[PDB]
Every structure is written in structure tokens, then in C-alpha cells.
Amino acid sequence: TVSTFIDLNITMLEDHEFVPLEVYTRHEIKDSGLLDYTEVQRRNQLHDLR
Amino acid sequence: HLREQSRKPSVERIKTTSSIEFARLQFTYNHIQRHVNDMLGRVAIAWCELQNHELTLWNEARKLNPNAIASVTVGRRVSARMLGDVMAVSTCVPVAADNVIVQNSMRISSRPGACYSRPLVSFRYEDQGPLVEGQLGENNELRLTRDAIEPCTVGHRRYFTFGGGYVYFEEYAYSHQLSRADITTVSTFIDLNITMLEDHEFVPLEVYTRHEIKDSGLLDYTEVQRRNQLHDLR
Amino acid sequence: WQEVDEMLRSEYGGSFRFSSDAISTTFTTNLTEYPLSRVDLGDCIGKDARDAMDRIFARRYNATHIKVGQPQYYLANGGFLIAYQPLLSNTLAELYVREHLREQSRKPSVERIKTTSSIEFARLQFTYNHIQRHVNDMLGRVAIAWCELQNHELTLWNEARKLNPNAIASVTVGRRVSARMLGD
Numbered sequence: 001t002v003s004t005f006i007d008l009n010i011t012m013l014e015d016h017e018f019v020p021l022e023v024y025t026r027h028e029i030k031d032s033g034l035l036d037y038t039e040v041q042r043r044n045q046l047h048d049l050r
Numbered sequence: 051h052l053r054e055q056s057r058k059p060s061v062e063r064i065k066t067t068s069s070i071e072f073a074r075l076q077f078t079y080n081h082i083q084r085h086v087n088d089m090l091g092r093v094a095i096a097w098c099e100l101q102n103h104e105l106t107l108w109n110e111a112r113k114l115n116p117n118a119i120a121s122v123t124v125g126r127r128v129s130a131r132m133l134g135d136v137m138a139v140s141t142c143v144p145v146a147a148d149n150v151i152v153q154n155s156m157r158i159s160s161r162p163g164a165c166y167s168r169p170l171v172s173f174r175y176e177d178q179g180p181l182v183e184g185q186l187g188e189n190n191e192l193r194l195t196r197d198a199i200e201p202c203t204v205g206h207r208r209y210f211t212f213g214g215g216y217v218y219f220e221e222y223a224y225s226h227q228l229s230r231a232d233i234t235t236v237s238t239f240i241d242l243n244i245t246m247l248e249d250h251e252f253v254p255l256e257v258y259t260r261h262e263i264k265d266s267g268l269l270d271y272t273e274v275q276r277r278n279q280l281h282d283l284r
Numbered sequence: 285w286q287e288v289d290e291m292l293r294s295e296y297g298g299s300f301r302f303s304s305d306a307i308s309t310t311f312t313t314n315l316t317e318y319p320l321s322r323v324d325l326g327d328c329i330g331k332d333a334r335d336a337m338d339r340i341f342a343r344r345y346n347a348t349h350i351k352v353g354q355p356q357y358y359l360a361n362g363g364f365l366i367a368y369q370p371l372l373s374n375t376l377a378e379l380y381v382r383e384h385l386r387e388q389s390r391k392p393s394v395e396r397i398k399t400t401s402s403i404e405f406a407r408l409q410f411t412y413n414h415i416q417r418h419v420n421d422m423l424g425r426v427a428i429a430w431c432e433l434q435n436h437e438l439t440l441w442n443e444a445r446k447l448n449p450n451a452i453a454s455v456t457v458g459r460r461v462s463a464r465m466l467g468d
């Protein structure tokens with residue numbers, strides 16, 4: 001068999017899922033400061049009851 | 051309603067990410083993907099229909115000229131004819147272009163009033179083999195039977211495909227060969243222009259860096275502490 | 285920051301590009317390794333890199349590919365370090381000799397590398413590159429197939445013009461003309 005047809009190949013672009021990605025979370029940013037003022041306050045205001 | 055009602059079936063605090071960009075990307079991708087996939091699918095289908103549609107043309111075409119149609123459909127210069135409803139082919143024999151000779155006159159002196167209708171040639175198969183008399187057919191074919199004649203007519207003027215060009219006879223007399231460039235050309239083709247989408251680089255971009263955000267506060271508590279705890283040693 | 289099983293390194297335009305389909309990211313580095321010697325206090329880089337890679341290779345590739353050279357560390361734009369480990373499948377393992385050498389050809393004060401806070405640029409770059417590649421491929425295929433089709437139908441038009449030179453020439457020339465064959 002010979003053919004008079006001209007081929008053409010089209011495959012659909014497959015699905016692709018995007019997972020959530022973060023370089024730094026806000027908890028790491030809150031921990032970036034050398035002294036979280038709030039936690040220092042809460043610790044130091046327990047001295048009499050401790 | 052039932053289908054939506056079929057979805058109903060300790061404690062926890064749900065944690066939400068800080069970057070919505072992943073779902074936005076996913077939306078953009080899905081949108082584009084859907085569109086391009088749709089259109090290209092349509093193209094594939096329409097093309098597929100077109101081929102079957104033109105089959106019908108090719109059957110009548112091959113009835114008209116089996117040599118050229120088979121030569122295209124097979125991939126090499128062949129000869130063909132119909133054996134009822136099927137085709138029969140056979141591979142031809144090539145001949146080097148320097149081993150073909152167009153004769154000057156297109157009129158046979160033996161019987162005047164009859165001039166050969168197509169120019170006759172004389173060629174050889176090997177560069178040392180014997181010479182062979184023939185006649186020029188269509189598309190650089192060398193015919194062996196010189197049965198192509200015609201009653202000589204005034205006003206005769208013909209071009210014939212020869213080599214990679216043409217040969218020109220006026221009044222059954224060899225005028226001159228003539229290459230393809232010297233005849234105005236029309237085209238049966240339909241143009242289509244596709245340029246690839248060029249590359250593009252994305253440089254990193256930030257509206258505010260985290261150092262500017264740390265500096266946004268009017269008083270960084272840590273730096274104040276470090277400065278103020280140096281008073282005795284200072 | 286990110287462990288990446290399948291990280292494809294493709295070279296082009298004088299740049300290495302590390303694309304991870306998993307995290308959907310594409311990093312861009314120069315074609316030479318970043319020396320871990322220049323990292324101010326960074327033993328956890330080499331240690332964590334080697335350990336993590338031993339774990340990944342042990343988990344997934346131990347029956348399909350072959351480790352090609354010691355790990356290499358490249359610095360990707362945006363300030364990202366990339367430990368990397370080239371590989372080569374059991375199929376076409378013939379070219380271990382050349383590829384090992386090729387990966388070994390990348391080896392040649394102190395500084396602290398600064399990393400950007402937004403990975404979105406490399407994610408965009410990955411999405412764009414993916415789409416671009418696909419659409420470019422398909423449209424190229426279309427251009428080729430069309431081009432073949434025109435030459436294919438030429439053969440039809442020659443016999444057609446033998447059948448009816450007036451109409452065929454009227455189409456092929458652009459105006460209503462009359463025509464006939466002067467031989468060929």
C-alpha cells in the first residue's frame with residue numbers, strides 16, 4: 001500500500017498541578033528577630049507568681 | 051440536588067499559606083492549556099478530514115496520468131498503469147544529464163510534410179556505452195519510440211522541459227536552451243507563516259525586601275536592647 | 285530548603301537550567317560550579333546535601349540509573365544554592381565514559397550568599413518555558429505538514445490545467461485569462 005495522505009501529529013498539552021511553595025514562612029520571619037518583644041514580656045512578668 | 055447532598059460526610063486549627071500565587075498560576079495554566087488544546091485538536095480533526103476528501107481527487111488524477119501520480123505516491127520515478135481497479139508500477143532507469151543530446155531539427159527529411167511533434171534526443175546509459183535514439187517526453191522522460199509526429203505548420207513555437215530547464219524550438223528548428231529563471235512564474239501554493247515564540251527570561255522582582263520590612267518598625271527592639279546594654283562597659 | 289528528586293539540568297545559551305516538575309520551578313545558573321569553599325561557615329551544606337541525595341537515590345533510582353560523578357553545587361540567580369547529582373539510566377549506559385568526564389569538567393576570601401524572598405519568578409519562568417515549548421512544537425509540525433501538502437497538490441494541478449487551462453490559469457494568475465499548452 002502507498003498513501004496519498006500527509007501525516008500530522010498533535011498531542012494535547014498534559015495537565016500540570018502547581019503545589020504551594022514558600023521560600024520563608026511568616027513564622028520564620030517572626031523568628032528572624034533576635035528578641036520577640038512579646039515573648040520576653042510574657043516570660044518576665046511571671047517572676048512574682050513563679 | 052441529591053448529588054450535592056451526597057458530599058456532607060477532636061479539634062484542629064487550620065493553617066493557611068501566605069502565598070496565593072500557586073493557585074493563580076494553576077488558573078492561568080489551566081485556562082491557556084484548555085484553549086490551545088481545543089484549537090489544536092480542531093486543526094488535527096479538520097486536516098484528517100481533508101486527506102480523505104482529496105483521495106477522491108487522486109483516483110481520477112491517477113487515471114489521467116499514472117506515471118506522475120505513482121511517481122509521487124511511491125517516492126521514486128516509476129511507470130504505472132491500471133490493471134482493472136489496481137495499479138501496476140516498475141522502477142525506471144536514471145540517466146546522467148551530460149549523457150543526453152537534443153537534436154537540431156524537428157523535421158524528418160525522409161518524408162517531407164511530417165515533422166516530429168516533440169524534440170527527439172540521443173543518449174547513453176554508461177559513460178562508455180552505446181548511443182540510443184529516442185524522443186523527449188514530459189518531465190525529462192526519454193521515450194524510445196519516435197511515433198510522436200505532426201503535420202508541419204507555420205507558426206510553430208514550442209518550449210519543452212529539458213534537464214533542469216527548458217529547450218526552445220521555433221518553426222521545428224532548434225532555437226536554444228533556456229533555464230527556469232527567464233519565464234514569469236505563477237504559483238499554486240498558499241502561503242502560511244509560522245515563527246516560533248521566542249525565549250523570555252524572568253528576572254527576580256520584589257516590591258519590598260524583608261530588610262525594608264524589618265526597618266519599617268520605628269523601633270527594632272533588639273537593636274535598642276543591644277545598644278542600651280553597653281552603658282557600663284562604655 | 286527544597287529536596288528535589290527529579291531535577292532536569294538542560295544547558296543552553298551559556299546557562300544551566302534546573303527544572304523541577306515537582307515543585308514547578310526553573311533555576312538559572314552559570315555553567316561552572318559554585319565552590320563550597322567560599323561559603324562562610326557552611327559544612328551543613330555539603331553534609332545535608334550528600335545525606336539527602338544518598339537517601340533520594342536509595343529510595344527511587346537504585347535499580348534504573350547510575351551515579352555520574354560526585355555532587356556539584358551551582359549558584360542559581362535569586363541567590364539559591366543547588367546541590368546536584370547527575371545520573372544516567374541503564375538504557376544507554378554506553379555513554380558513561382563521556383558524560384562522567386563532562387560532569388567532572390565543571391569543578392573549577394569568604395562571602396554570605398543572600399537569597400531572595402520570592403520564588404515566583406522561577407515558577408513563572410518554568411510555566412512559560414513549558415507552554416512555549418509545547419505550542420512552538422505543535423505549530424512547527426503544522427508548518428511542516430502544510431508545506432508538504434502544497435508540493436503534493438502541485439501534481440494534481442498539472443493534470444487539472446491539462447484538462448481546463450482557462451480556469452486553472454484564471455485562478456493561478458489572478459484574473460480571467462485564456463491559456464493553452466505550448467508543449468510543456
Ligand SMILES: *[C@@H]1O[C@H](CO)[C@@H](O[C@@H]2O[C@H](CO)[C@@H](O)[C@H](O)[C@H]2NC(C)=O)[C@H](O)[C@H]1NC(C)=O
Nearest residue numbers: 007008009010011012013014418421422423425
Ligand atoms: C506522535 O506524538 C509523539 C511526538 O510528538 C510521539 O509520542 C512519543 O514518542 C516518544 C519517542 O519519540 C515515546 O517515547 C513516547 O512514548 C511517545 N508518547 C509520548 C506521550 O511522549 C509519537 O511517536 C508520534 N507519532 C509517531 C508516529 O511518531
Ligand SMILES: *[C@@H]1O[C@H](CO)[C@@H](O[C@@H]2O[C@H](CO)[C@@H](O)[C@H](O)[C@H]2NC(C)=O)[C@H](O)[C@H]1NC(C)=O
Nearest residue numbers: 239240241242243244245246247248249423427
Ligand atoms: C513571516 O514572519 C513575520 C510575520 O509574522 C515577518 O517577520 C517580521 O516582519 C517585520 C515587519 O512586518 C520585520 O520588521 C521583522 O524583521 C520580521 N521578523 C521578525 C522576527 O519580526 C515576516 O515578514 C513574515 N514573512 C513575510 C513574507 O512577510
Ligand SMILES: *[C@@H]1O[C@H](CO)[C@@H](O)[C@H](O)[C@H]1NC(C)=O
Nearest residue numbers: 312313314315318359360361
Ligand atoms: C555568572 O558569570 C557572570 C560573569 O562573570 C557574573 O557576572 C554573574 O554574576 C555569574 N552568575 C552567577 C555566578 O550566578
